[PDB]
Design a protein around this nucleic acid. Structure first.
Lengths: 74, 51, 62, 121, 204
RNA sequence: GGACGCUAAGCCGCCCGGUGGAUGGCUCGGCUCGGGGCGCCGACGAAGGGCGUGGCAAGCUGCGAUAAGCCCCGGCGAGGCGCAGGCAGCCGUCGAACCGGGGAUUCCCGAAUGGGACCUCCCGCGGCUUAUGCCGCACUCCGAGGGGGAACGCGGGGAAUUGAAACAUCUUAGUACCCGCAGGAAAAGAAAGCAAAAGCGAUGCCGUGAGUAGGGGCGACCGAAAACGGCAGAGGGCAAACUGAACCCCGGGCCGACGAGGUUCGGGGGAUGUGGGGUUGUAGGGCCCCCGUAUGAGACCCUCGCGGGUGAAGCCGAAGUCCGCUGGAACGCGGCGCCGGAGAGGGUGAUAGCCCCGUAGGCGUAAGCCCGCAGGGUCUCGGGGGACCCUGAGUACCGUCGGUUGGAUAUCCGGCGGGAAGCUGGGAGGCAUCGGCUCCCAACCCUAAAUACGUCCCGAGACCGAUAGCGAACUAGUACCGUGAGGGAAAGCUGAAAAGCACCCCGGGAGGGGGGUGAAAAGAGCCUGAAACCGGGCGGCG
RNA sequence: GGUUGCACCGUCCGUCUUGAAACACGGGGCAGGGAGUUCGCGGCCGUGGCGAGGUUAAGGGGGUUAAGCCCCGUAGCCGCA
RNA sequence: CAGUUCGCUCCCGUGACCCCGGGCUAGGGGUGAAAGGCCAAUCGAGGCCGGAGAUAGCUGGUUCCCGCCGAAUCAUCCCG
RNA sequence: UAAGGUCCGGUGGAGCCGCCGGUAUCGCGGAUCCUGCCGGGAGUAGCAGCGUAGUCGGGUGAGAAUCCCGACCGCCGGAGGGGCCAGGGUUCCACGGCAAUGGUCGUCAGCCGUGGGUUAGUCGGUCCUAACCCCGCCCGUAACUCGGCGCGGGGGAAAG
């Protein structure tokens, strides 16, 4: 109906198309790294999350019982 | 000699000899416009030739 | 070495391999007894590979 | 509606490749109006052995005997449907059987006689 | 295609671009979006969109809307269908109409009713198509005439398919396509007493 | 002075002719998908390859010195002689071409196998015959094998760039790649199972359970299953206990529809145990006793006549080629008329329901398949009585070290060491042990059906169209390059019919020009014929 | 419209750059080729259906030449703490 | 002229000499009177294909028009 | 405003639109971009350099500085010559040609076309064994077209 190309048009001679410079768009370094890109990591490779809180961590605990002994009532 | 041509290799050489002929006239009339002569024509200085 | 090699030796002259009869390639090695386009003189199988390198060439050739 | 070939390209491929016996069928021409009713046979495969009339194309109302039936060029030659060559020869004029209507049936093959009387009707 | 040839580097040092061509003949390329025989940016996939669900309620309402367009004279005429019977649309005819499957006998009831005029339109080829699309096929078509809806005498009727633009259906296997082909509404329907009675009942 | 009195060369625009091959229309090709088929073959000498072979043969295609072929049967049957539309010549209508099945010959090389070998050649036996002709033989099993096959399947061996913004566990991945091996599916598979403790009882696969449990620099990441709904269904046979030759195989003959079944004659296996018995679970294992008693109602198979459909890819199949007009030719315009269980799509000199292939409909059989219908043969079974029977070993399980997986204390398997028990016993239910409760018998074997492929055939397109889609629509994996491994193009279009230009002038001229060539600005990679560009000219400037 | 004289103004184009007429980079000329696509998941939005409920997947039956559409299936998910 | 040539000049020319044909040694391996030289116009570790469209914070480039609003080149952390 | 559309005249000689709803291998000025075609440079450089060869009559022919015949003059002279090893494969020989090929030229030619030419007891290959190689069997390896031992057999010199 609409396509991505339709929305870009052929544009202003931006030659990037909504991501500013054409030198920060050439690969995966540009993203800051591929995937999540460390969290509990000692380097601050990804420093700050995607929310303002910086970074939010994982590896806290509390047991789950075996599925057979549990019941969550209805 | 040249060394040397076994019995079967004279046969091969002979096949190679046939190809170095222009296509005969009777074919071109039979096709009814035309067949160009078409490269399988052999030289002897310029021909080095894997097997 | 260094470019400019083609005036030095009258090579190729006399081969180091000959014309096969299992495939007709010019690789049936007369100083061993092995075919390096399909195996012969040491072999009863043709070469068996899933690369494909050979298998593909051969099928197109056939 | 009907089983079809809707690609024209495969339909043409079918037409070219046909077996020799089937190529005879493409070479059939309507029986003239008197005959068509009388045998109840719509058409039959034109041969050498028949007389034919050309009613369409440059000769119209001309009739002549069939000299040849050619199955590769898919055209038939009738005597006096001819061209005049500019090197002083009189050469035949090929026309397709589709422009043409088969004015008389002359039977000299026994299968063909069985068919006209019996099956074809 | 477009990984058919290895692609090896011509390099720098000679003052042309460093953009790879091939080994043996520099005259073609691959793994570029150019070239004969090659990929674009990304070829078309087999994985493209080809299913669209619609909810059971949503589909059923569409059926109701499209059949409603039919019973209004103004919509039928806009679509191009011209009808003698201005006050009566759609047409219900006696239950005997189904059994008849002589092409000619079922034609006559149409002619009288004034609904042959739509069939004349489909006699004229209007599914004619310009361009080289002729090569792929599916041109020289006939225009969709009226819709004949029957209760039985199978799903297709053997004296109602021959006619131009007359497409046959049953009310168990009715569809949005038949009600408004192309999303253009205003196509005539013709009922049989048993079909009309059976459609009264709602299926889903 | 000013005036066009002569402003060449040249600049700019346009025009005309050429060059060039873009552009449009054209497409006997690709590409993708759906359905079905094909579902193995080979020393009984395969596939693949080589060189010849045609009247003329350069390549392709087909064949094998019987050389673009030979024979037989059945089918269709009136013109043919591959691509290739030349001439000569050849054969058929007294049955060709073509299609299906089957057969003959089927060179040399190649698993190639007697030996060697640049695709050739030589030989040692034995049969054979006029004989060298001609037929069989000399690698490795037992008294049947190599090798090939489009992918898929089984079992092993098993990376790295990459990710983690680096980097080593981890990740990539049980991927790529390598070796052996089977089939038309493979393999799994008839319970020492599950464990919602309740309910179920062979096994695949698809949807779901779920990005859930769990693993993991606890970082990135990785990751089930039981269960549910479906699909399709089919179960049995060995070892032993106890009997103890009651048994099995091979070649020849006979009898019988070659068969089902039985007999005899020469050998071999078998008392280191064939057969009877019995087979997940203790069956009471044995020996008994009543009776019908393993003949068997069936159930299975085999033989052969009939009937029905299928199956030689082949038959048959309606209706305008009417009139006037234009045109090179109507498939156009006007008019009249025709069929339908039948207005699909190509073709025909153009735009055709009724000109033609065809079509809706129905039909066909040999080898061959399925069912019942005439005969013959084989064949499972059923109760209660004492001592309950080693009833499957380096197994179960444990110890040491790994591999691997989601597998966590609780995956799975391997190597090294230790090492049981006798259903009276043992195992399992996600830590150990002991107890309760429930289920279930490992250490023997096979298994139909539902599930994987894409060689092939057909049908289809919001798919592409000759500097695009396969590298390749056209003699292509060809030409061609490289020691080799391996790499790899370009080349589609006359016209209705070739009428493909007689005859004449000129030209050394086969070239070209003049004239005659329906259209030739369709006259020979010839439909159309762009731009850049070259020549001359026109208009302006100089 | 073609071309030209006069008055006036006028240092290409694209990219790079704080600044390009540039002694920064790239271009002989014309034609053709030539670069935002698919899948999964998450977060947004618009429209539309239904409503304290909503939605069915797989499958076979069915219909059709095939097929889609039409009906069955509620397995299962989500919300109602 | 030549992807290593031409002329002149120079060293060796019975020697640990040159030279032909056959065979042998292969990729973290050979060979080396030892230059990290050489191993088919490629050697501080050959070529080929597969993995593979390796990865880049790095250069170049990314195509039709119009309308409206219209910047920041600062701040914290980070083997940054 | 525009992206773009429409009409006329010539050419062309068979297919072609508009409207609405869909769809994407959908729109180019540049990438030292890929490809095809074409101009300037130029009619310039190159067709001189090394031990540096032609020239005059006559024959032929459409055409003759370089084809041939005659005369005269050179260059090479144990070696830009003769015979052979390797290799080439018909280049050999004959006849007919000049569009193409020969650093110009062409009636000539190894180019183009078509026929034809290599005849072996006593030459050599084959054979012998050499350095040395390969196969079968045993064995290894999970396995192999992998690997070598111990056996058995064959191969191995166109300059011995």
């Amino acid at each position: 109906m609409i396509r991505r190309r339709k929305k870009v048009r052929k544009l202003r001679g931006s030659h990037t198309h909504g991501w500013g410079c054409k030198k920060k768009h050439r690969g995966g370094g540009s993203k800051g790294g591929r995937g999540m890109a460390g969290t509990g990591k000692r380097n601050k490779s990804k420093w700050t999350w995607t929310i303002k809180y910086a970074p939010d961590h994982l590896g806290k605990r509390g047991f789950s019982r075996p599925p057979e002994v549990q019941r969550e009532v209805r | 000699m040249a060394r040397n041509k076994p019995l079967a290799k004279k046969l091969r050489l002979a096949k190679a000899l046939k190809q170095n002929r222009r296509v005969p006239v009777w074919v071109i009339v039979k096709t009814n416009r035309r067949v160009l002569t078409h490269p399988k024509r052999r030289y002897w200085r310029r021909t080095k030739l894997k097997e | 070495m260094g470019s400019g090699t083609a005036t030095f030796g009258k090579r190729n002259s006399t081969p180091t391999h000959i014309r096969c009869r299992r495939c007709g390639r010019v690789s049936y090695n007369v100083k061993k007894g092995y075919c390096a386009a399909c195996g012969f003189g040491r072999s009863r199988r043709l070469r068996k590979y899933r690369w494909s390198k050979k298998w593909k060439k051969k099928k197109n050739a056939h | 509606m009907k089983i079809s070939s809707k690609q024209p390209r495969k339909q043409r491929k079918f037409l070219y490749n046909a077996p020799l016996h089937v190529r005879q069928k493409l070479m059939s021409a309507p029986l003239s109006r008197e005959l068509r009713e009388k045998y109840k046979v719509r058409n039959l495969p034109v041969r050498v052995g028949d007389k034919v009339r050309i009613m369409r194309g440059d000769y119209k109302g001309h009739e002549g005997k069939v000299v040849e039936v050619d199955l590769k060029r898919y055209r038939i030659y009738v005597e006096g449907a001819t061209l005049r060559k500019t090197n002083g020869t009189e050469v035949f004029y090929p026309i397709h059987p589709s422009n043409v209507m088969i004015i008389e049936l002359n039977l000299e093959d026994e299968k063909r006689k069985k068919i006209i009387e019996r099956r074809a009707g | 295609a477009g990984k058919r040839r290895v692609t090896e580097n011509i390099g720098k040092g000679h003052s042309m671009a460093r953009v790879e061509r091939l080994k043996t003949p520099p005259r073609y390329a691959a793994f570029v979006p150019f070239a004969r025989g090659g990929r674009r940016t990304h070829p078309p996939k087999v994985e493209k969109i080809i299913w669209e669900d619609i909810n059971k309620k949503e589909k059923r309402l569409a059926l109701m809307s499209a059949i409603a367009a039919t019973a209004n004279y103004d919509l039928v005429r806009a679509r191009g269908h011209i009808i003698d019977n201005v006050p009566q649309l759609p047409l219900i005819v006696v239950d005997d109409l189904q059994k008849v499957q002589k092409t000619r006998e079922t034609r006559e009831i149409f002619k009288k009713l004034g609904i042959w005029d739509d069939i004349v339109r489909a006699k004229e080829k209007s599914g004619v198509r310009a361009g080289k699309g002729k090569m792929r096929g599916r041109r020289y078509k006939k225009a969709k005439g009226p819709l004949i809806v029957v209760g039985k005498n199978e799903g297709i009727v053997l004296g109602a398919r021959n006619h131009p633009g007359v497409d046959v259906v049953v009310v168990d296997n009715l569809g949005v396509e038949h009600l408004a082909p192309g999303t253009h509404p205003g196509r005539l329907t013709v009922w049989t007493v048993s079909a009309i009675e059976r459609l009264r009942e709602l299926y889903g």
